[PDB]
Motif scaffolding. Structure first.
Motif, PDB file in Angstrom:
ATOM      1  N   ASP A   1      -7.481  -0.684   3.365  1.00 30.60           N
ATOM      2  CA  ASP A   1      -7.743   0.482   2.531  1.00 30.60           C
ATOM      3  C   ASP A   1      -8.540   1.578   3.237  1.00 30.60           C
ATOM      4  OD1 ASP A   1     -10.362  -0.439   2.588  1.00 30.60           O
ATOM      5  OD2 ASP A   1     -10.392  -1.060   0.486  1.00 30.60           O
TER       6      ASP A   1
ATOM      7  N   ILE B   1      -7.257  17.289  14.509  1.00 30.53           N
ATOM      8  CA  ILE B   1      -8.433  18.086  14.848  1.00 30.53           C
ATOM      9  C   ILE B   1      -8.315  19.503  14.311  1.00 30.53           C
ATOM     10  CG2 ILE B   1      -9.617  19.213  16.761  1.00 30.53           C
ATOM     11  CD1 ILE B   1      -9.045  16.502  18.323  1.00 30.53           C
ATOM     12  N   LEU B   2      -7.237  20.216  14.659  1.00 29.90           N
ATOM     13  CA  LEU B   2      -7.110  21.603  14.226  1.00 29.90           C
ATOM     14  C   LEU B   2      -6.868  21.722  12.726  1.00 29.90           C
ATOM     15  CD1 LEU B   2      -4.922  23.331  16.974  1.00 29.90           C
ATOM     16  CD2 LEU B   2      -7.371  22.885  16.960  1.00 29.90           C
ATOM     17  N   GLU B   3      -6.164  20.766  12.115  1.00 29.70           N
ATOM     18  CA  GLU B   3      -5.721  20.916  10.733  1.00 29.70           C
ATOM     19  C   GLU B   3      -6.228  19.810   9.814  1.00 29.70           C
ATOM     20  OE1 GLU B   3      -2.982  23.277   9.768  1.00 29.70           O
ATOM     21  OE2 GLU B   3      -2.283  23.984  11.727  1.00 29.70           O
TER      22      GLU B   3
ATOM     23  N   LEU C   1      -9.063  21.330  23.464  1.00 26.53           N
ATOM     24  CA  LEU C   1      -7.855  20.507  23.499  1.00 26.53           C
ATOM     25  C   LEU C   1      -7.001  20.838  24.717  1.00 26.53           C
ATOM     26  CD1 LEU C   1      -6.926  20.492  19.707  1.00 26.53           C
ATOM     27  CD2 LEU C   1      -7.243  18.432  21.092  1.00 26.53           C
TER      28      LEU C   1
ATOM     29  N   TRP D   1      -4.169   6.966   7.320  1.00 24.97           N
ATOM     30  CA  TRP D   1      -4.462   5.772   6.540  1.00 24.97           C
ATOM     31  C   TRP D   1      -4.182   4.506   7.343  1.00 24.97           C
ATOM     32  CZ3 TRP D   1      -6.858   6.184   1.909  1.00 24.97           C
ATOM     33  CH2 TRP D   1      -6.867   7.457   1.328  1.00 24.97           C
TER      34      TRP D   1
ATOM     35  N   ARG E   1       1.208  24.771  16.389  1.00 30.70           N
ATOM     36  CA  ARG E   1       1.978  24.272  15.268  1.00 30.70           C
ATOM     37  C   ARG E   1       3.420  24.648  15.546  1.00 30.70           C
ATOM     38  NH1 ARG E   1       0.199  20.472  11.529  1.00 30.70           N
ATOM     39  NH2 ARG E   1       1.614  20.487   9.725  1.00 30.70           N
TER      40      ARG E   1
ATOM     41  N   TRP F   1       0.840  -1.188   0.000  1.00 30.36           N
ATOM     42  CA  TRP F   1       0.000   0.000   0.000  1.00 30.36           C
ATOM     43  C   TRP F   1       0.878   1.242   0.000  1.00 30.36           C
ATOM     44  CZ3 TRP F   1      -5.165  -0.471  -0.701  1.00 30.36           C
ATOM     45  CH2 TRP F   1      -5.733  -1.727  -0.446  1.00 30.36           C
TER      46      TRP F   1
ATOM     47  N   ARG G   1      -3.463  28.374   7.935  1.00 27.55           N
ATOM     48  CA  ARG G   1      -4.266  27.188   8.224  1.00 27.55           C
ATOM     49  C   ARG G   1      -4.917  27.180   9.613  1.00 27.55           C
ATOM     50  NH1 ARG G   1       0.372  23.716   5.836  1.00 27.55           N
ATOM     51  NH2 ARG G   1       0.879  23.298   8.033  1.00 27.55           N
TER      52      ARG G   1
ATOM     53  N   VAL H   1     -11.047  26.688  15.027  1.00 30.22           N
ATOM     54  CA  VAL H   1      -9.741  26.460  15.644  1.00 30.22           C
ATOM     55  C   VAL H   1      -9.720  27.001  17.072  1.00 30.22           C
ATOM     56  CG1 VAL H   1      -7.311  27.120  15.541  1.00 30.22           C
ATOM     57  CG2 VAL H   1      -8.467  26.301  13.485  1.00 30.22           C
TER      58      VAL H   1
ATOM     59  N   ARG I   1      -5.775  16.640   9.452  1.00 30.68           N
ATOM     60  CA  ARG I   1      -4.935  15.548   8.971  1.00 30.68           C
ATOM     61  C   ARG I   1      -5.729  14.252   8.854  1.00 30.68           C
ATOM     62  NH1 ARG I   1       0.054  12.477  12.033  1.00 30.68           N
ATOM     63  NH2 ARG I   1       0.173  10.750  10.525  1.00 30.68           N
ATOM     64  N   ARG I   2      -5.479  13.516   7.772  1.00 27.95           N
ATOM     65  CA  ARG I   2      -6.125  12.239   7.506  1.00 27.95           C
ATOM     66  C   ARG I   2      -5.113  11.103   7.639  1.00 27.95           C
ATOM     67  NH1 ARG I   2      -9.619  11.131   2.076  1.00 27.95           N
ATOM     68  NH2 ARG I   2      -7.797  12.117   1.091  1.00 27.95           N
TER      69      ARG I   2
ATOM     70  N   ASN J   1     -11.682  24.732  19.216  1.00 29.75           N
ATOM     71  CA  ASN J   1     -11.024  23.437  19.311  1.00 29.75           C
ATOM     72  C   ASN J   1      -9.772  23.501  20.177  1.00 29.75           C
ATOM     73  OD1 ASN J   1     -12.358  21.253  17.844  1.00 29.75           O
ATOM     74  ND2 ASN J   1     -12.162  22.577  16.044  1.00 29.75           N
TER      75      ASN J   1
ATOM     76  N   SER K   1      -2.853  15.068  17.696  1.00 24.74           N
ATOM     77  CA  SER K   1      -4.254  15.358  17.983  1.00 24.74           C
ATOM     78  C   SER K   1      -4.626  16.764  17.536  1.00 24.74           C
ATOM     79  CB  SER K   1      -4.553  15.159  19.467  1.00 24.74           C
ATOM     80  OG  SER K   1      -3.834  16.075  20.272  1.00 24.74           O
ATOM     81  N   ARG K   2      -3.689  17.710  17.621  1.00 21.01           N
ATOM     82  CA  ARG K   2      -3.910  19.000  16.977  1.00 21.01           C
ATOM     83  C   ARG K   2      -3.840  18.876  15.462  1.00 21.01           C
ATOM     84  NH1 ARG K   2      -2.779  19.883  21.667  1.00 21.01           N
ATOM     85  NH2 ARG K   2      -3.394  21.727  22.884  1.00 21.01           N
ATOM     86  N   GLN K   3      -2.944  18.030  14.956  1.00 16.97           N
ATOM     87  CA  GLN K   3      -2.862  17.827  13.515  1.00 16.97           C
ATOM     88  C   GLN K   3      -4.175  17.288  12.960  1.00 16.97           C
ATOM     89  OE1 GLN K   3       0.650  15.391  12.842  1.00 16.97           O
ATOM     90  NE2 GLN K   3       1.831  16.810  14.121  1.00 16.97           N
TER      91      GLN K   3
ATOM     92  N   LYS L   1       0.879   3.977   1.429  1.00 13.54           N
ATOM     93  CA  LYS L   1       1.174   4.607   2.709  1.00 13.54           C
ATOM     94  C   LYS L   1       1.981   3.718   3.646  1.00 13.54           C
ATOM     95  CE  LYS L   1       0.178   8.034   3.978  1.00 13.54           C
ATOM     96  NZ  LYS L   1       0.813   9.382   3.918  1.00 13.54           N
ATOM     97  N   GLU L   2       2.291   2.460   3.244  1.00 12.42           N
ATOM     98  CA  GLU L   2       3.096   1.741   4.220  1.00 12.42           C
ATOM     99  C   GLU L   2       4.582   1.976   3.957  1.00 12.42           C
ATOM    100  OE1 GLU L   2       3.516  -2.610   3.799  1.00 12.42           O
ATOM    101  OE2 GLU L   2       1.928  -2.473   2.293  1.00 12.42           O
ATOM    102  N   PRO L   3       5.418   1.919   5.013  1.00 12.72           N
ATOM    103  CA  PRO L   3       6.855   2.199   4.854  1.00 12.72           C
ATOM    104  C   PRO L   3       7.519   1.569   3.637  1.00 12.72           C
ATOM    105  CG  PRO L   3       6.367   1.870   7.146  1.00 12.72           C
ATOM    106  CD  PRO L   3       5.090   1.558   6.405  1.00 12.72           C
TER     107      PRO L   3
ATOM    108  N   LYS M   1      -2.797   1.770   6.772  1.00  8.86           N
ATOM    109  CA  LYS M   1      -1.477   1.160   6.659  1.00  8.86           C
ATOM    110  C   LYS M   1      -0.353   2.076   7.120  1.00  8.86           C
ATOM    111  CE  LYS M   1      -0.597  -2.334   5.371  1.00  8.86           C
ATOM    112  NZ  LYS M   1      -0.566  -3.672   6.026  1.00  8.86           N
ATOM    113  N   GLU M   2      -0.661   3.314   7.533  1.00  5.68           N
ATOM    114  CA  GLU M   2       0.543   4.026   7.934  1.00  5.68           C
ATOM    115  C   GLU M   2       0.836   3.783   9.412  1.00  5.68           C
ATOM    116  OE1 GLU M   2       0.370   8.342   8.643  1.00  5.68           O
ATOM    117  OE2 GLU M   2      -1.633   8.294   7.734  1.00  5.68           O
ATOM    118  N   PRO M   3       2.126   3.844   9.798  1.00  6.65           N
ATOM    119  CA  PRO M   3       2.515   3.571  11.192  1.00  6.65           C
ATOM    120  C   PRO M   3       1.621   4.193  12.260  1.00  6.65           C
ATOM    121  CG  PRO M   3       4.462   3.910   9.876  1.00  6.65           C
ATOM    122  CD  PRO M   3       3.292   4.198   8.967  1.00  6.65           C
TER     123      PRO M   3
END
Ligand SMILES: CC(C)(COP(=O)(O)OP(=O)(O)OC[C@H]1O[C@@H](n2cnc3c(N)ncnc32)[C@H](O)[C@@H]1OP(=O)(O)O)[C@@H](O)C(=O)NCCC(=O)NCCNC(=O)Cc1cc(O)cc(O)c1
Ligand SMILES: CC(C)(COP(=O)(O)OP(=O)(O)OC[C@H]1O[C@@H](n2cnc3c(N)ncnc32)[C@H](O)[C@@H]1OP(=O)(O)O)[C@@H](O)C(=O)NCCC(=O)NCCNC(=O)Cc1cc(O)cc(O)c1
Ligand SMILES: CC(C)(COP(=O)(O)OP(=O)(O)OC[C@H]1O[C@@H](n2cnc3c(N)ncnc32)[C@H](O)[C@@H]1OP(=O)(O)O)[C@@H](O)C(=O)NCCC(=O)NCCNC(=O)Cc1cc(O)cc(O)c1
Ligand SMILES: CC(C)(COP(=O)(O)OP(=O)(O)OC[C@H]1O[C@@H](n2cnc3c(N)ncnc32)[C@H](O)[C@@H]1OP(=O)(O)O)[C@@H](O)C(=O)NCCC(=O)NCCNC(=O)Cc1cc(O)cc(O)c1
Lengths: 138, 418, 417, 421
Positions: B302, B332-334, C380, B339, C295, A58, C367, C373, B336-337, C376, B328-330, A60-62, B341-343
């Motif tokens: 997926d 919630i505030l921004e 937080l 996946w 940030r 995938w 951003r 924000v 971030r999504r 939030n 958690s700010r990334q 996104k995996e390393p 499979k990511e670490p």
């Protein structure tokens, strides 16, 4: 990128992929020149996992980093693709990629592989194993 | 008494005076929009001041000095009748509910002020949170038939007992399980049935197969709050945003508060069980929030998780403990999504499995949480992670903070773009 | 009762001995032990007095919590209303004239006082509110900042631009080493950022340095001025306590305003999001600041460390970013964390090559604009770090740090920089 | 009020049934349910009585919180001053005369008592101080230890060397499986380490083992003695509770001394930094200890697991502490589902500071003992623990722990699993 599509990635100078993509080489017949090239990208264990045992990787995996330079969210992909196209214009780029490919994969290396490939793949094309399986697609 | 009830009534009088004589929301002038906005602010400022000193006295009147457990809906309606102008009546909420969010006066904010002041009280707060942990009447109604059949089909949730497992399947095939007031009613009822059924030992939450052309034949866990309903004015502060946090989500953490009708009740007044979640497709918004309270989380390779102008429920309370302050700010505030499979998915997910290997991996997970020891250990774990004071303090501020965001001008714009 | 009389007796013995004994460094071991024993008896009674009398003491000074006094005003007012409980402005001036080695440690008495005040559930939160109020210097300079979008101070240059409060720490000669003036400037600038309605997000970054080893290079912070600390120029109250209760706490919670604007019923404090950009390195108090931003950006070549005194509130906050193992590694054992190693993500959101840093910083400032924000970040921070939690820590910090400020091992090592 | 009378009548009903009914294993289903209902009715009143009367009860036993009583002393005094509230020393002696399967579970009554005491904002903190004070045994052995630098006990060997209190857990025959004596030896050793002015850092390590499968190899800890637990030899109060409130909490907060030295006004407790070194593996209660040290080292081949929970019981305060080390997901994986963590995998960097080869381990341990000498470290670790784990946090947890663990100690599934070891 599946099968022959994934094989192509082993030959480019830069590869980008969306966060939700995957790469696989799923069986039957030989996956083109992937047997020649995948080992140099991923080592002997991973390439057999991918080729002999159909492991799927995938974006996104390393270990996708072994095949892909950048992994980008779908919204951010188009702009990143454009940025990558600006970074390879030099005559130095041509000279350096020429020496890189020469070391990675020699004339003898490619020729020796393709020689055996021509017969090995021909035999796989007419084996009872392939003919049945491919005829069950759908 | 200290004059504050008179000042409130006098401030509420001006607001109703202005609303009667002024034009409609969309036909007001800048001077008119500033006059009413100032009238609202003066009234609400006194709602806070009144309740800062009189909250316990108000709640004791409504609850017979904390001897009658009233749920949220019943409480805010009783407060409306016992304290006119403190919180909207019902006839006023019906007028509000007919309008699009853009055109509302924001009377629910007054409910935010009320619930905040109650939850801040060390006496009333814990009493209200116990009230919301007791079984719903709908579930008590449906329990005998569920014990007999092992099946209940509801609009947004299909519940099934099988092999001692409560299988909750969110089945809004047309909307990727978008949440609404009904879904909350079905979820709380379904959870109650799982918890009170003695033949059920573990719960399982999963999204069902979808019918919408873009996801036909594919399971989807959740796409979060229904944005259409939110724009149309159909998302209740009390009956949705608050009800789900104090009801079924909190019952997943702590269980249902029973009467005193079984041995053990002296040490375990609540019946709680372990819960397993399996994420197909993606978990967005309120669906992603739910993952912060389960004992095992599985997800297909997926899938993705995101928390996308309002507060993401109690994610602000819980995400940092899973992911630290930065991520958690990334998230919630921004926005971030993450996946599957990511670490860093391992901060949210125990197992990530290929789609062809997911059904079987889920089954194995349901066998591994059967003990009475499991019940004691998750109880000691949850107690350490999230204290009564901690949860109560958060939800108090949330009731007001979320209420204002529900009526923020940037919110109304963003949600109305589809 | 009896404790105030016993205290007054013990302080009298101390001032009697100090009048008659020789100066620090000319005392004999027998003499050094007599004065140390007098200090111990006095400070023990300061603790015992305030354990029961803190609330009454604070109520006298604040009109039963009717007047918000900042720290400096509080300790000074305490000295004149309660002689011998805490040092006078005079006694402090003599102390300040000495190098740390030769001081008597009267500031420890302030550590005792502030601990007892902050331990009070009634006085504690009231003092923390007092320190969240806008500084008078900022109220003074706000109209001119609203009109010019620029204020230049000794240690901080502030500029409003594109709705961004740009704080640039610009002590080019000393790698932004912190001192009492820097705190006065940092608090003043933060206040202006928060009270200026034309400011929506803040930015903290270090300015270009002039010292020959770093000429032309930005550097975020190299921590406390160790030279001043050795020389006796680091105030427990006016530096070590002021920064934690003032500008750092205002980054988290905003400024507590008067009930002089709509909304105040739901938002008595004005708070905004904050972005930090670490060039070079963030050492000591500079690294501490990173635990409070929304940030954080850093250039590929930067590092973070906390290098013997307590590193402010890092003991309070580092565990929540990095857990108990790494935080002891950083604090107890001086581990240094590099921007490009994996665990820097516990402290840093983006690590970018210096040639791409400037643009990366700009993108982050766009951003964090929402009111969403603001709602939030408030929920937080409330969950991350509770009022009780912060107050409980800072109370004990007042004494523990006061003692560490005057330990023989600290005075020795600080004098070797 | 009436609750003491209702309790005394409910306890009387229980004593009547126990006197007249057949022994445990010879009872009928009807007889089994009648006695169980009496226990429940009585214990429910112990909870209700103490919910309102906890502070008053504790005040009588402690003379309005001016006398510090340890756990054993407290639960006995409560037995005599309040008959039927908690079992007597005689009732308990009969209990331990039985295997766990046959016990009545009177210890559950002690769980109810200690929970209510620790829940009190007044009684709770007072009891936690009592347990932080030095044990008589350590005060007894302090002179000879100051002179000799050595104490040999049954389960622990203590040695001062180069300013280091080297505790070596030395149950060579059983992989340092824990029991009531081990807790006594551990707390005694910890006390001596803290009170000895010649000790600056502590060190905990497992000794060389003699059992044929581990002969010549060090092993840190194999957790609670499962054999003794089945046989009924693991005390709720004198082991499961004593270890959490005593020596483990003294590693965190130190020993509470008298007002008998300078500093006692800023430093009422003597605390020192502690280093742990894991050879072989750290299982159960041994792994629980790691969540409390200032530096943790382990050999590359060691592993960490908490195989209580699924098996039978709560793993001490690991439920309190693990989440802050590893988060809610990993901590549930370890506790709820028996996940095992190996020294060389990435996430051992959640519990362990250094993982080093067996041939390089001793040298790394020595070097680590040189790095924690300061008064600055002491102030810094004190501020850290204060933030990591608050007095209220620990007290709230241990209160509920006292009852929850007591019930698990007598659970139907636990008694089964422990008897198969
Ligand atoms: C990616 C998938 C999982 C998704 O499928 P679904 O989401 O279930 O959708 P589908 O409806 O199948 O996809 C829509 C559409 O794609 C078409 N499709 C997908 N794969 C194929 C292939 N391989 N051939 C033809 N058509 C295809 C399929 O016919 C559908 O059209 P309908 O008949 O209208 O249904 C699926 O497409 C799949 O598994 N396909 C088979 C993939 C595969 O094995 N491809 C061949 C890989 N093997 C090589 O490349 C070997 C090779 C290549 C070389 O170039 C050289 C060489 O030496 C050796
Ligand atoms: C899922 C997507 C990314 C991809 O969908 P696509 O494959 O692009 O297809 P679409 O056609 O958009 O979606 C398919 C289908 O589902 C419908 N759908 C999907 N999600 C929704 C929502 N959230 N509302 C309404 N309808 C929806 C969509 O309208 C389509 O149906 P029709 O319009 O009837 O044709 C996209 O739909 C999308 O962006 N959805 C919005 C996701 C989102 O932000 N949801 C809300 C997040 N916010 C919360 O949960 C907030 C919250 C919830 C709480 O419970 C408590 C609380 O305190 C706060
Ligand atoms: C920054 C360095 C790593 C760079 O190495 P070099 O470039 O070789 O170093 P230098 O030549 O010393 O740096 C260049 C220049 O900056 C000057 N500089 C840098 N930091 C300082 C300080 N803190 N004081 C004085 N001068 C300083 C240094 O003196 C040089 O100027 P000259 O005297 O003219 O030579 C190094 O200088 C160094 O190690 N500095 C000391 C860093 C340090 O220990 N900082 C503070 C540690 N502890 C705290 O802040 C504790 C603290 C702070 C708080 O705010 C609150 C609290 O509770 C506790
Ligand atoms: C680690 C092992 C796999 C070693 O494998 P082997 O090399 O095959 O070992 P063995 O030959 O069995 O070990 C040698 C020997 O040590 C003894 N031994 C080993 N482990 C134990 C335990 N756990 N208890 C007692 N005796 C033991 C036993 O006598 C063994 O064989 P004999 O002497 O011939 O009878 C094995 O020992 C093992 O699995 N032991 C079980 C460990 C276990 O589950 N411990 C429970 C941990 N849980 C707690 O302590 C819970 C707890 C503790 C607390 O302190 C507080 C609290 O609140 C909760």
């Amino acid at each position: 990128a599946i099968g022959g599509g994934a094989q192509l990635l082993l030959v480019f100078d830069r590869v980008l992929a969306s966060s939700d993509a995957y790469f696989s080489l799923p069986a039957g017949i030989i996956p083109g020149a992937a047997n020649l090239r995948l080992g140099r990208f991923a080592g002997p264990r991973v390439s057999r996992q991918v080729i002999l045992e159909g492991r799927r990787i995938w974006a996104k995996e390393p270990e996708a980093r072994l095949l892909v330079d950048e992994v980008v969210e779908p919204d951010e992909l188009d702009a990143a693709i454009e940025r990558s196209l600006t970074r390879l214009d030099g005559d130095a780029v041509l000279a350096n990629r020429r020496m890189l490919n020469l070391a990675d994969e020699s004339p003898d290396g490619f020729r020796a592989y393709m020689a055996e490939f021509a017969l090995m793949q021909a035999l796989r094309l007419y084996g009872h194993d392939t003919i049945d399986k491919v005829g069950r697609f759908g | 008494t200290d004059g504050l009830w008179a000042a409130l009534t006098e401030a509420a009088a001006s607001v109703e005076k202005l609303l009667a004589t002024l034009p409609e929301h969309g036909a007001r002038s800048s001077a008119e929009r500033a006059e009413i906005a100032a009238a609202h602010d003066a009234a609400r400022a006194l709602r806070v001041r009144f309740l800062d000193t009189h909250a316990d006295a108000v709640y004791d009147r409504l609850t017979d000095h904390r001897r009658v457990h009233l749920r949220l809906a019943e409480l805010v309606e009783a407060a409306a009748t016992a304290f006119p102008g403190l919180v909207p009546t019902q006839q006023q909420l019906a007028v509000e509910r007919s309008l699009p969010q853009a055109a509302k006066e924001g009377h629910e904010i007054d409910q935010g002020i009320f619930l905040r002041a109650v939850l801040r009280s060390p006496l009333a707060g814990p009493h209200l949170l116990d009230a919301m942990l007791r079984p719903t009447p709908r579930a008590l109604e449906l329990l005998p038939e569920f014990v007999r059949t092992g099946e209940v089909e509801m609009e947004a949730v299909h519940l099934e007992r099988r092999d001692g497992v409560a299988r909750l399947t969110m089945c809004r095939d047309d909307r990727l399980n978008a949440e609404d007031g009904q879904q909350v009613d079905d979820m709380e009822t379904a959870v109650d049935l799982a918890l009170l059924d003695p033949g059920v030992r573990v719960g399982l939450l999963r999204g069902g197969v979808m019918s919408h052309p873009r996801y036909r034949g594919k399971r989807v866990f959740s796409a979060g709050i229904n944005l259409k309903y939110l724009s149309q004015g159909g998302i209740s502060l009390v009956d949705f945003l608050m009800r789900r946090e104090l009801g079924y989500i909190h019952k997943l953490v702590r269980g249902v508060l029973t009467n005193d009708d079984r041995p053990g009740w002296w040490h375990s007044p609540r019946i709680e069980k372990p819960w397993v979640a399996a994420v197909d497709g993606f978990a967005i918004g309120g669906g992603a929030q739910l993952l912060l309270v389960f004992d095992r989380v599985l997800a297909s390779s997926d899938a993705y998780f995101s928390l996308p102008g309002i507060i993401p429920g109690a994610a602000n309370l819980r995400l940092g403990r899973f992911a630290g302050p930065r991520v958690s700010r990334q998230v919630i505030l921004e926005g971030r999504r993450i996946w599957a499979k990511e670490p860093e998915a391992r901060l949210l997910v125990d197992e990530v499995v290929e789609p062809d290997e997911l059904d079987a991996a889920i089954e194995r997970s349901l066998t591994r949480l059967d003990g009475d020891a499991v019940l004691a250990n998750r109880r000691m774990l949850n107690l350490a992670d999230e204290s009564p004071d901690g949860f109560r303090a958060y939800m108090a501020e949330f009731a007001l903070m979320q209420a204002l965001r529900l009526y923020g001008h940037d919110t109304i714009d963003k949600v109305g773009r589809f």
